Amino acid sequence: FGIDMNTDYTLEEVGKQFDVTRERIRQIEAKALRKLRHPSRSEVLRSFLD
């Protein structure tokens, strides 16, 4: 995404900047998303929903 930076880079370009460009990076994105689903981390944004 673009959080704190200009244009957002897609999977392949982000992997290039890590030099590891493959399914593992999207899987890392998905694991972060899933683990952040759990409340106490989400409660602040859970209420922050509108």
């Binding site: 995404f1 673009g2 959080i3 957002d8 998303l33 952040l36 989400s42 944004l45 922050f48 929903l49």
Partner: protein
């Protein structure tokens, strides 16, 4: 803006394409609905209440 996209991803926030306009009662007015009238133009499909 990006962070909203992040939040939409996280919580599963399916964006509804329709804005709200409904006629709410003015501030500080309280009474009984005494009557209702409905004016539909010829052609359009009247609704149950009409």
């Amino acid at each position: 803006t990006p962070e909203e996209k992040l939040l939409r991803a996280i919580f599963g926030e399916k964006a509804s394409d329709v804005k709200d306009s409904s006629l709410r009662v003015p501030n500080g007015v309280s009474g009984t609905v005494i009557d209702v009238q409905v004016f539909t133009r010829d052609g359009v499909e009247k609704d149950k209440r009409a």
